[PDB]
Design an enzyme around this catalytic site. Structure first.
Site, mmCIF file in Angstrom:
data_model
loop_
_atom_site.group_PDB
_atom_site.id
_atom_site.type_symbol
_atom_site.label_atom_id
_atom_site.label_comp_id
_atom_site.label_asym_id
_atom_site.label_seq_id
_atom_site.Cartn_x
_atom_site.Cartn_y
_atom_site.Cartn_z
ATOM 1 N N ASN A 1 33.180 62.977 -2.425
ATOM 2 C CA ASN A 1 34.021 61.964 -1.797
ATOM 3 C C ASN A 1 34.001 60.646 -2.569
ATOM 4 O OD1 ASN A 1 31.314 61.569 -1.040
ATOM 5 N ND2 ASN A 1 31.905 60.538 0.868
ATOM 6 N N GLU B 1 20.995 62.243 1.496
ATOM 7 C CA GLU B 1 22.015 61.501 2.232
ATOM 8 C C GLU B 1 23.026 62.527 2.739
ATOM 9 O OE1 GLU B 1 22.251 58.038 2.673
ATOM 10 O OE2 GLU B 1 20.490 57.488 1.483
ATOM 11 N N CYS C 1 30.881 59.676 4.922
ATOM 12 C CA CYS C 1 29.753 60.092 5.752
ATOM 13 C C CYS C 1 29.459 59.104 6.873
ATOM 14 C CB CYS C 1 28.509 60.256 4.881
ATOM 15 S SG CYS C 1 28.580 61.572 3.652
ATOM 16 N N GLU D 1 18.809 54.788 0.040
ATOM 17 C CA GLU D 1 19.386 54.332 -1.212
ATOM 18 C C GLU D 1 19.669 52.842 -1.118
ATOM 19 O OE1 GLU D 1 22.772 56.998 -1.778
ATOM 20 O OE2 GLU D 1 21.603 58.186 -3.213
#
Ligand SMILES: Nc1ncnc2c1ncn2[C@@H]1O[C@H](COP(=O)(O)OP(=O)(O)O)[C@@H](O)[C@H]1O
Ligand SMILES: Nc1ncnc2c1ncn2[C@@H]1O[C@H](COP(=O)(O)OP(=O)(O)O)[C@@H](O)[C@H]1O
Ligand SMILES: Nc1ncnc2c1ncn2[C@@H]1O[C@H](COP(=O)(O)OP(=O)(O)O)[C@@H](O)[C@H]1O
Ligand code: NA
Ligand code: NA
Ligand code: NA
Ligand code: NA
Lengths: 488, 488, 488, 486
Positions: free
Chosen positions: B151, B250, B284, B462
């Protein structure tokens, strides 16, 4: 013999609903120490539901309120040090000279350390612009599970539970089935200190069942495991297969001890002895590959032989006993298989190599302290963790060679160098692939010092400030005070 | 169509030895964008050996020398932003209005952030007593592997590689087979900036083969994965059965947007729009469960309908276009099956719910912006991540209820609240089980702000200073200057 | 001959309104380098008003926007290194072999270091209870003042301005009347890099007038001073009598170099040379008390004399010149007064002790490299800082003695030990009362390393992350979301 | 009984031959005669502290932690005894001293005790052949100079970080209120603190304080008091040995009531920000800015609150207002109250001394509120340090911010608003170190506190204050060959 031991859920001992039990033995005598109830799958669910309720009470208290409760537990541990050490000696076979000086002392040290750090657990604030800023919270994970090992039962229980509770979590602890007794005592101590019911629950059981039910439970946010590599891989698989958990692993090693050419060999021999034969060699951080300069190999071998003759096996409660049996007969069988592979692969047996016999030894799983020399990097005893009293002495010629060979392993737990030279000590240590490095010493593990493995020897760390933080999760919160703009 | 794209290993493009290839499609036209070679198991081993050599050079440099090289890469990325954005639009289907303003800009923002923090990466020193002290080193992990999603291809590659390289590691990056092109361009940019050969290698391939070979390799110390929940468990499982690696994940979410009763509904609708339909809902962090007070639901539905009317689908390179096709036609089929599940469970379709047709749409993987209302917690479209342009609107009555329902999910990635009230904003956010929380906004992810999921939405974080540290491993070193005492 | 130098206020050169000027001399020739305008009280007032305006613009920028501007200044400094160094050599008399390799290189290193750290400047967040939390902001102080010394003019200006600007402040810098020229060049460079007007203003002048006006100004929030002890006290007095400023001071020292009994004497001699005769002895950190074991003193003296004879005074632009004149003729008189006290107090002159004479030296403020031995702790040359090329060699008999004598001083800036022994190096250094300690080296001052004085040698620190934070002030903010309870 | 100095773990006679008296402000009677430390006494305390500091610093971090926590346990057990002595010396109601003074003093000691093991240096790699590490070393001997409004709390807030960092502290309490500092010294010794690590030297600031600031072997001064006395401290410390100074001075803190504020909440906050400890608190929000559209309602609401104030026997449970610390101090508070009338302010209540049975013998000043106040009146610009609230009206948010900031003081500030943006937006623009949103006065051990601009230098509490009682030593280990250019 003791009364039957029950599960500890929500501030009280309680019968297991699994219907199953197991026995823990005194490895010095083979006698049954106690019958112990095993926690079933429904017992784990009850413990989790207890832990969830307790955790909310615990987390809602003030930081200093949490600190005061943990320090009260410390005070109890200091008072009962000798009684707890004696129980540990009965359950593990480690000499009382060890358990009364290390196990509870260093376990309470870590609890004491984290108790005082609770008020310092802080998030951050980050200005983005006049109209917006970010702040972070270090929130509890919720309910975490610790899976203990049998060589340092109460120390492991404290090193796992102390940062978890200090971070605001509840912990469900599953001790090793070999050594469940001191974990149950610790749960009692926590409640006596004021820990809310459910914040520390203890579920004795077998790994195949009770351990697996914990790793699979969907409401457990983190697993912390100390043990053998095989049991670790399964835990990681069922923990991967089930709900996505943070896992922390402390496994074994084949740690190198490097003796420099300028080192005093009496000091080097003393360090090598302490790095191999404490707790009868059943210690993950042991320096079982001893690298000695060729020019000093013969003299070092004599110094080891002199010191090995001083090892005193006997009554585990006698003050001068400094060597115990291995924890079980199956564990000794594995150590004996490694010893035989050393003989067959051409290593020179310098001393030991056989079971001990006679009154007082025929009922326990004793192995004589064993030293191999003339060892080579391809030998099984050099490449694999034995977890018994077996030292391998290896010769080397130059510093680059010994660094290469010390690092040529998938293990990564500990390392050490013996040298009086400033440059040599730091230069060599900086090149070793290990998480725990000792210069001119071995084995000391201060509460302040993060410890854990490189490569295949572990994941994550224990002790130090960083381990308190690792039992929290970060939530980032953006406050947007300006007008929000949409492109739609 | 482009020349067959090769692997990037040790500062050059090199042919795969697998004999296997795959294709990436333009989702706006169905055309083949390029054939791409797939890295085999031997190619992975080659990349690891290259990365091991490059990492040694990279780590031997000064901190500021590494900083200058990464900042040069930043400068190249800024200069080539528009060229890179166009390739990203062709590969992903995202409008140029997005890729040119966000993807590379925020990817380069993170690299620029970490470039400056390298010199501040410090260990600790701890006095134990006059005669002994401890110091720690934050050492590189060595070779790490990043597995990217489709994405945000180049942004993910930068968000993984920037902290990894800043910490002294080499990264082998495997882009998603759906969108492999921009990662290969990134590798050339890094080399042009002065990154030593081997420090950033790109191995396109399939997750089942190339991804698995990376997760299995014994000499990779850490895996960072971004993707769907299903593939993440396999990665953790394959990584568990194999070498014991540090893991970061993630994964997706089902993040709640809680509109409060005192919220401006125009602001709330704008936030809801941006949280659901940016990048055609393939994000997400999207707020795909929109909780609205019952008393405002009808008015909110009207305002949503107005904003959907302003959405401008069309040519992805037009300035006014702000909505694109999905990344692939198979992904559109999955999104359509969720839409049909919404109709069949009785959710009320407010708008959309079908593919887009006509000239310039009949050949693209277009789905109309879709809003379901009258939604309930047990519906499939409310429980599962769709990763498409599908907003679900849920009515609620009181604050306690909406907190319970927001939290009643295995997902934990993001959350948000719309309210002008000081107490309500913080009080709600502090009780939500999510790692990324927006107050009166959505979607902004500053380089300074750690981001990642609770529960099943991920492991680790992150961005932020903490992620630089998470790409190092701690080595604790004790200097003992006193006499060592052996008990033997 | 250079044009008359003006004040630099708000991004342009501007004439002083004092009606006063001063001259700066080339210390190698005695000629007037330039006439320089002196800032009066109204000029200082004008600088503050300019600084107040610029600081608001600078602080309203994003952290990364500030970072990029400072890195642009770094790039210009690297490009103009040689040109700036030649100007510094003309103004200070230091050899180009020093100025082109150290002064701007390490000045720019610190600016480059802080530019990257701006985004990591973070506050904190502290949860008190469910209903209340605290967060902190690290805000700029506003307008700060730096007062430079003459021995490292542009380095001091960078070491002071870099953390001040990086923290979001504006700085008014007052260079030493001896060496004003490079500070005005630095101001031009900042503007060319994009620094907002008013953020770095430079006011040449005299300490009794321009310096005092800055230290007295009510709207200056912090003073940073490098210089002699007498001038520092004046700064501290005027700052106390006036608005309540925070003061930071880097003053002189009489730093000990301890040569251990196991040290290689060639290394010891090389370190002692670098610790005494760099920049013609005009360095605050110089190791001017060299402690040598009695049994090695005679051999050490021989090695020093062989190295002193290699010292090459001459044309300051010649590649092989490594020794320069003192900064001014009045300073030489003070140094000659100290040399005469050494002779008169009975210290033995081993070499030097007089001015240099002949073609090329008669017009410069030259002093021969001077070494005294047989020195005792009560001698004036041992107790007081000379700031010239004068080494004092002191004999000692044991480690406890040399530590006592090293510490028996009001100064506390630097210290060092020469020894290959691990335990000796750390053990001695841990007992020395100094802020900057070198083992087997001298003089290196990395940007990451905080540096400053114990006791009378300074207040506060420069460099390191802590110095960036010290140019901010903490604001604590409590958010109370519960009901407030009054006892009235 | 004649109170003595405390040096090296015992009470000792002063060698000054000087003494002073402390008055019970509720009765005017002398509470005790106290010996005053002279110059030889200061040199004695410093020499004792130097010897004690080495023993203290040589212990382990946890050994120091355990000793400080034992002192905490003693302080808790003796809370009521210590609180009563504090009430006699200060005139603060027992309802305050038993609930705040020792409670919050011990909280900071307890907090710092736990942080000692986390006090760490750093390690910085430079290259394969060189690295740097830092030590956070004790300063050595430090001095604290306390104020009279919170005697034992200040002694604990200064001594706790100093001792936790491994220093010895010499504490000079205010001559107005010297008694509780001497009990604390006894408590520390009972807890196992080595002799000399906490010495207490009562005296006069003109003498005893100066001798501390001038002593060459004291490395840092931490001072809490009034601006004038602070400037004298900083001057004498400047003229003398180069010391790090820290100062916590007064303020004229603004309390900003927003247009969406509940005026019941605002009035309660204003009452606690002005009339706690009879208004003798540096962080008090003495300037209460209220919207004109609400002034009259807030005024009514202030009069209702002021009417519940219960002055009386300081040991009574319901008493919540006490006399000022001294009758001389009362005159200064009354001098400011008279200036508001002369400057045109409307007296909404109070403004005179209190009279009748039980009040004629005390240093009572009535709770005072002025309204119709202007930014130019003396009572609005200068710290009164008494129970005097100034109500000021405003029209727009920018005005109240600039007026709030239009001062040389910078200590505290507060805003009352339910709006998310207004609270953060206003607070971020106020020039003060201590900011409260929808509350006032809470000062957690974790929270750094101190003044902007003329209201102070440095900070107290929080982890940063522990570090500020250490000094950094940087150590470079060069393992490569050293190159000389000579
Ligand atoms: N499959 C498993 N899942 C969870 N815990 C397990 C599993 N197998 C073993 N354990 C537990 O892990 C801990 C350490 O086991 P270890 O001693 O390393 O292995 P083993 O018992 O096979 O020699 C013990 O508490 C044990 O019960
Ligand atoms: N079993 C696996 N091992 C390693 N990587 C995998 C695996 N399965 C998928 N991946 C990779 O993970 C990334 C995200 O995958 P995802 O889209 O969630 O799954 P998929 O691509 O198989 O549909 C891609 O690079 C993909 O190729
Ligand atoms: N000149 C001074 N030097 C040192 N300490 C002083 C000085 N003047 C006052 N002090 C002390 O400072 C503390 C606070 O003083 P403060 O109440 O502000 O001043 P004042 O003495 O005018 O009432 C007390 O301990 C006081 O004795
Ligand atoms: Na047992
Ligand atoms: Na594609
Ligand atoms: Na000059
Ligand atoms: Na009194």
């Amino acid at each position: 013999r003791m009364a039957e031991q029950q599960l500890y859920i929500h501030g009280k001992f309680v019968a297991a609903t699994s219907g199953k039990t197991f026995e823990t033995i005194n490895p010095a005598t083979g006698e049954v120490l106690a019958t112990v109830q095993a926690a079933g799958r429904e017992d784990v669910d009850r413990a989790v539901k207890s832990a969830q309720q307790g955790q909310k009470v615990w987390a809602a208290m003030s930081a200093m309120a949490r600190s005061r409760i943990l320090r009260k537990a410390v005070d109890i541990l200091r008072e009962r040090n000798d009684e707890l050490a004696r129980l540990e000696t009965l359950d593990t076979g480690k000499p009382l000279s060890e358990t009364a000086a290390v196990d509870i002392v260093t376990g309470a040290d870590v609890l004491e350390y984290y108790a005082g750090l609770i008020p310092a657990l802080e998030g951050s604030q980050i200005p983005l612009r006049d109209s917006s800023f970010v702040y972070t919270r270090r929130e509890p994970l919720g309910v975490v599970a610790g899976i203990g090992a049998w060589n340092y039962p109460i120390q492991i229980a404290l090193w796992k539970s102390a940062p978890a509770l200090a971070a605001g979590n509840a912990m469900i602890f599953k001790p090793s089935e070999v050594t469940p007794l001191t974990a149950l005592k610790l749960a009692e101590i926590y409640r006596e200190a004021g820990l809310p019911d459910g914040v520390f629950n203890v579920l004795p059981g077998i790994g195949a069942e009770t351990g697996q039910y914990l790793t699979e439970h969907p409401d457990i946010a983190k697993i912390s495991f100390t043990g053998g590599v095989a049991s670790g891989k399964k835990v990681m698989a069922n923990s991967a297969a089930s709900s996505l958990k943070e896992v922390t692993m402390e496994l074994g090693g084949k740690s190198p001890l490097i003796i420099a050419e300028d080192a005093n060999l009496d000091l080097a021999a003393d360090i090598a002895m302490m790095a191999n034969f404490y707790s009868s060699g059943q210690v993950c951080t042991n320096g079982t590959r001893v690298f000695v300069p060729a020019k000093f190999k013969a003299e070092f071998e004599h110094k080891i032989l002199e010191r090995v003759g001083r090892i005193r096996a006997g009554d585990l409660f006698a003050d001068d006993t400094n060597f115990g049996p291995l924890v079980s007969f199956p564990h000794r069988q594995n150590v004996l298989r490694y010893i035989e592979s050393g003989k067959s692969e051409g290593a020179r047996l310098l001393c030991g190599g056989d079971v001990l016999k006679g009154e007082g030894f025929d009922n326990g799983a004793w192995v004589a302290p064993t030293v191999f020399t003339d060892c080579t990097d391809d030998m099984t005893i050099v490449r694999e963790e034995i977890f018994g009293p077996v030292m391998s002495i290896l010769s080397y010629d130059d510093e680059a060679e010994v660094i290469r060979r010390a690092n040529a392993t998938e293990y990564g737990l500990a390392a050490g160098v013996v040298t009086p030279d400033l440059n040599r000590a730091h230069r060599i240590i900086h090149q070793l692939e290990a998480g725990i490095c000792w210069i001119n010493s071995w084995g000391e593990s201060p509460a302040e010092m993060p410890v854990g493995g490189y490569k295949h020897s572990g994941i994550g760390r224990e002790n130090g400030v960083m381990t308190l933080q690792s039992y929290t999760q970060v939530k980032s919160i953006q406050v947007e005070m300006g007008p929000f703009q949409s492109i739609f």
